[PDB]
């Protein structure tokens, strides 16, 4: 096999610790390309995006060249990556200690010294979660690739060009790519970025940034958390039709709705991130419905106090009675003693009935206010969540789409 003598001649005087620059002040182009095989996860508890990506790296090495006419027409040789020099292009913004690739595949070399490497890797990059519109939110975080041990005076990172145009995107495979099930890839731009604060001689002067605009599918959160909580918070508006009696169960219903909301808070606390920069939208809605439930409990206590008043306990003033009953546009003396006792208990019952009617009027008055408050708050919060959509362009200041 001619590959044996070809490899023995190529690697006979090869030093993998040396940059392949031909002369002094020679900068080697290191073209990069990404291929997102499948989006594994985005764990917002530690704000880490776990992805599976194949990284295409192409460069030129003047050492590994051969005249194919001298050999038997061989023009493409696979060499293990451990025996060859590498640009050490690593993911800088990792959440773990894993910087390099996960497999170290063989690298292909051509006649002209062209070198093509395709290692796969599993990257747990950092991803600052914007919790403003959780769970209807969209996340804009990126993978940053840079040469760990070289500066801009030695290497020159740039995006690879295939047919004469720069591949400024992630280029997922249209067929062999399964959806995450909770995230949709809306925009996948890519760009070379300079820090412009450090000098060119610094290794961190240049980088290649692959963004990933990901929109969360809120289906599971709607089905299991949002809609049941909405139904529970809608139940508390029914309390104004329950009678204000011993068996009315008004305060029981309201406080048990509050207890259900507390259990929902316990459920929610295991899912929401702990960034503390902003309150999650689901958290805002939960605080709002808890405040509404507290106000409704207070109103129920007030209504029960009003409807259970007695002439023996309070005095019904003429002002209150007028206000709440006119402004609603929306050896023989034993028989005498029995008669007078019946008359006085009838009068006390009549005043109690007046208090009950006042309670009914205030119930009907406050029910509409509570219903409007709850409906407006819920609709406003969820319409704000729904209107939160991915921007049309990947960058607001650019007209390009960065889409093949």
């Amino acid at each position: 096999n001619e590959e044996g003598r070809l490899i023995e001649k190529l690697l006979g005087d090869y030093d993998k610790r040396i940059i392949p620059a031909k002369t002094l002040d020679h900068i080697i182009d290191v073209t990069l390309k990404l291929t997102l095989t499948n989006l594994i996860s985005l764990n917002e508890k530690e704000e880490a995006l776990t992805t599976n990506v194949w990284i295409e790296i192409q460069w030129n090495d003047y050492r590994l060249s051969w005249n194919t006419s001298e050999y038997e027409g061989i023009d493409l040789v696979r060499i293990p990556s451990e025996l060859l020099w590498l640009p050490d292009v690593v993911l800088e913004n990792n959440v773990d200690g894993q910087f390099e690739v996960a497999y170290y595949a063989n690298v292909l070399v051509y006649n002209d010294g062209s070198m093509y490497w395709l290692p796969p890797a599993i990257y747990r990059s950092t991803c600052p979660i914007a919790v403003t519109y959780f769970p209807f939110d969209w996340q804009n975080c990126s993978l940053v690739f840079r040469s760990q041990t070289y500066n801009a005076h030695e290497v020159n990172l740039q995006l690879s060009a295939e047919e004469g145009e720069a591949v400024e995107w992630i280029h997922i495979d249209p067929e062999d790519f399964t959806e995450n099930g909770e995230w949709t890839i809306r925009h996948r731009p890519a760009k070379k970025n300079y820090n412009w604060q450090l000098t060119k001689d610094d290794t961190d002067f240049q980088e290649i940034i692959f963004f990933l605009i990901i929109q969360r599918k809120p289906l599971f959160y709607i089905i299991n958390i949002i809609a049941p909580c909405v139904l529970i918070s809608s139940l508390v508006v029914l309390v104004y039709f329950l009678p204000a009696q011993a068996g009315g169960q008004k305060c029981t219903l309201s406080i048990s709705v509050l207890l259900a909301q507390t259990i929902f808070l316990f459920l929610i606390a295991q899912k929401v991130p702990e960034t503390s920069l902003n309150v999650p939208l689901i958290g805002k809605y939960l605080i709002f419905v808890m405040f509404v439930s507290m106000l409704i409990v207070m109103n129920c206590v007030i209504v029960l106090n009003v409807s259970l008043r007695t002439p023996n306990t309070h005095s019904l003033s003429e002002k209150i009675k007028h206000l709440f009953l006119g402004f609603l546009p929306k050896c023989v003396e034993a028989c005498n003693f029995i008669a007078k006792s019946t008359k006085e208990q009838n009068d006390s019952g009549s005043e109690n009935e007046n208090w009950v009617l006042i309670g009914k009027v205030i119930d009907k008055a406050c029910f509409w206010i509570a219903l409007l408050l709850f409906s407006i708050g819920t609709l406003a919060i969820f319409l704000t969540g729904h209107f939160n959509q991915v921007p049309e362009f990947p960058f607001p200041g650019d007209p390009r789409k960065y889409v093949p």
Binding site: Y103, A105, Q245, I263
Partner: protein
Amino acid sequence: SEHETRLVANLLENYNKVIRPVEHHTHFVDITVGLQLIQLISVDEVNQIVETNVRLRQQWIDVRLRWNPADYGGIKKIRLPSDDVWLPDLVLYNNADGDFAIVHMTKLLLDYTGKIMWTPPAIFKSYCEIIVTHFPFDQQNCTMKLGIWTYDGTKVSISPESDRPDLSTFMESGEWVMKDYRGWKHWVYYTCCPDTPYLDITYHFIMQRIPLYFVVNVIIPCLLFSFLTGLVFYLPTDSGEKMTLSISVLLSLTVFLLVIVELIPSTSSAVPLIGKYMLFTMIFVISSIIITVVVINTHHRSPSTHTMPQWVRKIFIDTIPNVMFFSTMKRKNPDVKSAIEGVKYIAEHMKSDEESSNAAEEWKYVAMVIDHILLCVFMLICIIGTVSVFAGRLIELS
């Protein structure tokens, strides 16, 4: 033996692990690749990752690793470390979390003709799409895609050892049933070079989940809660617990929602049948609570505040109760004259009390008839809802 040490020293004298083991570079190595499963480690739906334990039967022919047995004391088969000979770079294309290729690197069997047989073990964390629509009665089609990474056709060609993966030593998983298991070989051509096919082997398994655990631990409590939801309409409104029962079974369902979250997978690809039934039960409880609020409100409706309309009374008094045959429904001195006036006053007060109590009793009767009707309606709704949710998949299974 000293014969075997001499044989190994002579074989590995000038061997090069990097070089592809072929006679001429225009030819290719015919590598017979088969996979034998051992145990299904785990299946995760929130990440769509299936972890399996496999052994990779890889066979090929190395022309450099041959000898005459009669020249070495009759030795025919030897064992060699895998780090000394050329190894194909078989990679799982759809790898998710595990290692992309073989990492354990156990020893391999070498014959006197050069037939390298290698059986390394591996734990494959493959990425296969999880259809959660029919959970927990779902049927997953999980695939593992093996391919030569760096090389291609006419250099390193792989072929399936058998039409199906070996499952003779496959222990029972206890949660899944292997309905079918097959392995296909795909050629993929590219327009850049039509004479360089790219070869891969996909092994697909059809796993039908055993649903007993989710039926016992999730379906039964939800069914019990749904059955008890409609029971509240038989509870009379005279008892003050009519609201208490409904809101407390609602609290019980809310507590069981924690178990549902901690047990079922949390995916947004599609709503599972468990989620559909849980949402149906929740909406059923909410509607029952609204209905019993209406019943309680129409039970305490005072005759003075509201008069009974003729139509609703007519319907609920003399037509509907007659239909329900199974129910037991009911279908000379100032002081003397002042005492006389007091007796007349208490008599007319008792008359007014009797009239008001009769009107209130009419309201109670209307509420009771409504309770019976809605009890029957809600029981029928619960039964037909459970049947409509589950019987489709139950029939599709058989």
